Design an enzyme around this catalytic site. Sequence first.
Site, PDB file in Angstrom:
ATOM      1  N   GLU A 240      42.964 -41.167 -20.950  1.00 45.88           N
ATOM      2  CA  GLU A 240      43.795 -39.888 -19.550  1.00 45.88           C
ATOM      3  C   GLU A 240      43.640 -40.634 -18.161  1.00 45.88           C
ATOM      4  OE1 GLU A 240      43.964 -36.024 -20.688  1.00 45.88           O
ATOM      5  OE2 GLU A 240      44.255 -35.678 -18.075  1.00 45.88           O
ATOM      6  N   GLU A 266      49.769 -35.525 -15.071  1.00 44.00           N
ATOM      7  CA  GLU A 266      49.198 -34.061 -14.008  1.00 44.00           C
ATOM      8  C   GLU A 266      49.744 -34.443 -13.543  1.00 44.00           C
ATOM      9  OE1 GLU A 266      45.254 -34.591 -16.133  1.00 44.00           O
ATOM     10  OE2 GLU A 266      44.589 -34.544 -13.233  1.00 44.00           O
ATOM     11  N   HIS A 316      48.541 -30.244 -18.707  1.00 43.12           N
ATOM     12  CA  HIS A 316      47.976 -30.183 -17.743  1.00 43.12           C
ATOM     13  C   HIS A 316      46.980 -29.364 -17.645  1.00 43.12           C
ATOM     14  CE1 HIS A 316      45.274 -29.978 -14.416  1.00 43.12           C
ATOM     15  NE2 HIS A 316      44.583 -30.494 -14.123  1.00 43.12           N
ATOM     16  N   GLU A 336      45.556 -27.798 -23.628  1.00 42.72           N
ATOM     17  CA  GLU A 336      44.529 -27.995 -22.891  1.00 42.72           C
ATOM     18  C   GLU A 336      44.112 -26.986 -22.712  1.00 42.72           C
ATOM     19  OE1 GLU A 336      44.292 -30.741 -18.761  1.00 42.72           O
ATOM     20  OE2 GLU A 336      42.121 -31.296 -19.714  1.00 42.72           O
TER      21      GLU A 336
HETATM   22 MG   LIG Z   1      43.226 -35.150 -16.810  1.00 46.75          MG
END
Ligand SMILES: [Mg+2]
Lengths: 390, 390, 390, 390
Positions: A240, A266, A316, A336
């Site tokens: 990421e 994100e 995110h 997440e």
């Molecule tokens: Mg991240």
Amino acid sequence: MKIKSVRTRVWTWKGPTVPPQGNFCTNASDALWMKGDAMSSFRFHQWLTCEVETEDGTIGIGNAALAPSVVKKVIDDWYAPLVIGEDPFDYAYIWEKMYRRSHAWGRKGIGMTAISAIDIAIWDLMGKLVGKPVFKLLGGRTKDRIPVYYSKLYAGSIEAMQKEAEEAMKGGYKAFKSRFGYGPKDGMPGMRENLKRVEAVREVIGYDNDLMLECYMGWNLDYAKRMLPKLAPYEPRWLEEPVIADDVAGYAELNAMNIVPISGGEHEFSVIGCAELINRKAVSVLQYDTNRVGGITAAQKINAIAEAAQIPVIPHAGQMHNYHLTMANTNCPISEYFPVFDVEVGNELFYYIFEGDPEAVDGYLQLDDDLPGLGIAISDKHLQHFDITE
Amino acid sequence: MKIKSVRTRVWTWKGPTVPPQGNFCTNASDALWMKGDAMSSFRFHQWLTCEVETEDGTIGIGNAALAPSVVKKVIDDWYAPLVIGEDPFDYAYIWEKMYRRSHAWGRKGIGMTAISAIDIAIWDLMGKLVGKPVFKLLGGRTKDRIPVYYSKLYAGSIEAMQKEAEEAMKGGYKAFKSRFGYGPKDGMPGMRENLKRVEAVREVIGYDNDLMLECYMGWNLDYAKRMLPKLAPYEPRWLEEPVIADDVAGYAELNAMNIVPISGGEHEFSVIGCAELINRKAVSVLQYDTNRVGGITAAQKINAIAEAAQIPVIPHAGQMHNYHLTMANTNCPISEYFPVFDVEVGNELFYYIFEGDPEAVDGYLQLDDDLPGLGIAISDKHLQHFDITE
Amino acid sequence: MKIKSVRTRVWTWKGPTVPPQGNFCTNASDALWMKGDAMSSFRFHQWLTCEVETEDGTIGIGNAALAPSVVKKVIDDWYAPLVIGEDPFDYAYIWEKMYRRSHAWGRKGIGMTAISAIDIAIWDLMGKLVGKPVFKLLGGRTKDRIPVYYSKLYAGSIEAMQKEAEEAMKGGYKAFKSRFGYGPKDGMPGMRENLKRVEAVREVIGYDNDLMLECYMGWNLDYAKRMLPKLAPYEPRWLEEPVIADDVAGYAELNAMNIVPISGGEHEFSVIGCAELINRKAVSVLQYDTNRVGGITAAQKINAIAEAAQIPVIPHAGQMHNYHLTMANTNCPISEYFPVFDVEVGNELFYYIFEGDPEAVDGYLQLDDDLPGLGIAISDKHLQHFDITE
Amino acid sequence: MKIKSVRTRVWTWKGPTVPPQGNFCTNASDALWMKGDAMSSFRFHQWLTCEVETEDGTIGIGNAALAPSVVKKVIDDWYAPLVIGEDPFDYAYIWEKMYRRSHAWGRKGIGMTAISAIDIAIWDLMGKLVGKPVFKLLGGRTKDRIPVYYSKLYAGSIEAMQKEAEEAMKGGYKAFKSRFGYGPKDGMPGMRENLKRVEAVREVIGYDNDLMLECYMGWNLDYAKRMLPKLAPYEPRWLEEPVIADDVAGYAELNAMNIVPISGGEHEFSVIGCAELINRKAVSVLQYDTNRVGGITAAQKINAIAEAAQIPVIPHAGQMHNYHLTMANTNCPISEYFPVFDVEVGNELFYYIFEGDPEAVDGYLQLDDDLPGLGIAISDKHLQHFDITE
Ligand SMILES: [Mg+2]
Ligand SMILES: [Mg+2]
Ligand SMILES: [Mg+2]
Ligand SMILES: [Mg+2]
């Protein structure tokens, strides 16, 4: 029924926090040589709540975490006037008004974040107005339950990281995300420190589970390309934000190497903004946060684009503003999940401000088919730990 | 509240019709050497209505025009069972169930058309269930009124075409679409017959108005490439379906020439199907018909994809199942408008089956902000002109 | 000599069947959360026979397995009229008539499947009319015998899979295809379950034989890309249908990675449809089924395109409608062979309806140089196990 | 010598202004259907001054026009602390500190605008500290004098536009930029209104002079592509911002058509941001504004990138913060010149706040080889026309 007001407040945490540690999480500021906590400018010890109320008293709740005080000023001075007096169900038009009137300066960053908080609120409001959960309005139940990946495991001593991994395993998760603590400036020695910690986490969660790795914009194209071959043996599900958000070309180059899947987003803004990441195959997994990218109106459109391209969308942050979108689209496989925790980096700060965000059970989250809106309410449980400005 | 039943009926027109004429509208069958009316297999003298009713008696109305009797069989035998017993607000999941369970044979054509009729009905139903117009649920009012282009002007004698153009002008439209009556087999003489009619229409509507040209899959890549330079002087806004739907590569080649904008999509199916036309820049204007492409659920997603790519979406056909989508997206500038007329090709047949589709006033259409659902109802005004099978 | 009639019948199996089991074969419906047998909508417990008879009583036999009752309706109502009265030897024109007249709704799916059944029948008819085997009319004997790969080995317990592999080995095959039973939703644990079964089959057939792997549209682009590196060590000859048929872009991306050859096409339709898979290098091996793609007329053309591109054509399913095409083209190296078996998934159902399809001997099939047509006849051996509707 | 303070003030004009008129300047809000002045949210009736002072009292002057009050808050709360205590000559590091510490939310828009105001101030400061004009520090005199193009000519009656053109001609300019007043929503009639005004201006300035055309993000990809062929006969030097800033893909498509050169960039941010426009050939002429893009530090780097690509850099706006950069690079041929005027759109507002910006003489501007810094000072000439907040 028209919107009557927009109430924006900034909540500043003043309670105890977990003291910063070095080589904890790589970040965009590592490239500098500033003293102190490298995560200082990235922590979320403040949060913004945005309440959009209609004439009949119904209230929709939106939120944002990026530069709260500035975002609030934009909402109060620029966007509120474009929202008040409008029908919540003209949400796409309301969104367009904000996007175009402020296009010169708000298409990304502060502007789009402010649009996000307002838009999320408008959706919660619409759900309440017609008595439907937001996810139902977006398409309904595409999953019996939402799988989640445990997201924490910051870098530290091998002992501490393995201890956390052991604890995380008790949660039943089948996927975990861990952060790197060393980057470009640390050279090869740092590469070895990174690999040693990837291996340490693998020793605990094993290879029957997925492991995602987080750079948080702390590496660069060069270092990342050299790390990919070294990381592959550990079979990470994705890497990421290996580069800063502006380096989209870098994202595309790294992802095209097909050594380790690259994830990101994100820090990307607007529908077109994310559409570009998708079309340029900058990422193998798109991770916009609905309270940054432009709200649920924008996120819904982005999900359509990503679904057609078959690039999974795994937003995110684990909050209702993301869960509802994920529930309504087949191309959104998992969410997440930031575990409830002391105020550390701040990703868990929303748990102290809102009530209603579901907690993981054996690695899954669930949404209520009958609860209108986002299913959240502003909490009064931790008022003594906050300085709230309006 | 769950869906209780799905009622599908095929309406066959048995009233008077306008006798077929030659060199009226180019089409995919022109390449053959069959006798009779070349538009025979393309006319719509039948239509399908699909009514989805919930336990409380609320009814949503969907429809379809392609191969009605076959589409009906698919709905009755295959899709109805996947819809009955479900919550209308799980529409995205319901859509996915049909799409995936029948993916082997229904991703395009008959299957997707059946999905379309059901999905449109489900949206009308959702709108009625929560008392909201479909366009409000999709985003609301992005336009004060919907501009439309007059769509007819089939090929014929210069006198007849100019007479129709004069009449059409009285409607106040600022855009008109006309059909070609000559194609590849007619060689250069046919090219001149085509150009003579493009010029004839231009003589009447002038150059202060837009003129769109329709091939209806009656030309081929070769002929179309040679016609483009000859058409450019007439400044057409777009050239529609110059090749058969399967020749997507041809579409892309023609569009990339940037001589005359190429439009198409009324014969494309599914979200991914249209996403490909967009990503490959096969068209400058996308024209799926919601009652073919996969319904409002699919069309909404397609609109998001087209909007990000900034390729205008101007749905094929002027009906509520398209108008509501257009109203809710800024990238949907105008709608196609088939004027109320005698049963000729059949595009106007829906006017005899449904009540509620708005009629153009000075070149614009309007939607009611308070009327729930699609704002249409099945008509009993022309029952004596139909043989309805259930 | 002209065609006099087209007789279409749907055969529905009502005899005993092998009870469904879980994690048996991944499929496009796995992404949903429906209860029951995941292969329910994909099994072939029905089949269609299409008999085209000329004035002199000669009869050609065609067939189809996709949505039999709907395909039959299309043949009876739409295509039969375009075929009756025509010379079987105008087959390319007859094909074009069906393809163009119904292009708006039949270019893929139901329509093209119906065209397939009719076309195959017309070829069997032509062969009989001039006393030549179909393969002779297509080019003749390019192989002394046709090698075949054993196609079954569905996922199950390691013991059951190895037991079947041992039995299959006794057949003398040098290639075997096995199916996965776990997909995206199963996460990493499922990936390990898959790899464990690939390894188990390899333990039995060894590395001196080829192993092909089947996903049957049950995975997605994301999961497939992550599985490729894990599968490579097992040296599979190809990975079949890793994504749904609409995701052609995904096919191209996966195939271009050159980690494991990607195969597909059993769900693609028309000549142009397959030409696109070839030109876009979506597959390393093309697997259309002649009774779906458009018939022998279309398959012959597709074989020419694939041969020039040097992308092997290995048709889906082992039946005469495919064997004859394979025999006549050097770029068609082997055929898929479904062993005679109890009615399980249904791929073996044709053995109960037709007589003449060759059975494998030491891993090879043979065609008769003198037997006119396809060399098959409708069987009366299992009439008591079928409900035949006409 | 270290920086001691950062003083930011917002100047709000309260004097007389030119009343808004319709069809004056196309803009991003035209796509909506809001009432009132379409340029409302784009006018600059406020401006920001940023003064960076060192311990010895030397003061550098920076500025910004986008969302002044919000930009000020960012400077005061976020960036000032990263600047105070630093050596002005560590400008690249100071720039990097701001860019990376706030990367999550400031890489474009508000954040980068704030960085711009501070950076420009730091350069003026450096010039003063070493007694050198900013352009000397950047490379020196690459031109004997700076040519400029007259930038105004908003859309209006033909009489008014020609009257202004006649007056502008008296200035000796060899290039003029005019704005469109009609866009997509106006259809073909609007296209003709646009062309009529392009022709009207050409009638006055003739073809011995250059004419640039401005859309100010008021058109879209579709409309722009259709307008290009119609505009070409008028030989415009470039077409500015035909699409909204987010539609970079659209820019690239339009520019690649090579019908009319496309210019843009006044709404692009950061070095990488502009580098992308250059590398993707999104524009034929790059027009960032130094007080938006990231300041002189960023602009200098961008100029290097554009110069290597040989894509001319002609900064948006005629002010010292742009003139100095232009003077030092051979690839910066001319500057945009807003004539001194009453407060209308606001581009001329800086003339009321600062003293020192050169005025055009026979179409040229000049810089002083000995005047340190930017050569500007804050003016006290119009204090009575402003409400200044600190
Ligand atoms: Mg991240
Ligand atoms: Mg059309
Ligand atoms: Mg297969
Ligand atoms: Mg400009």
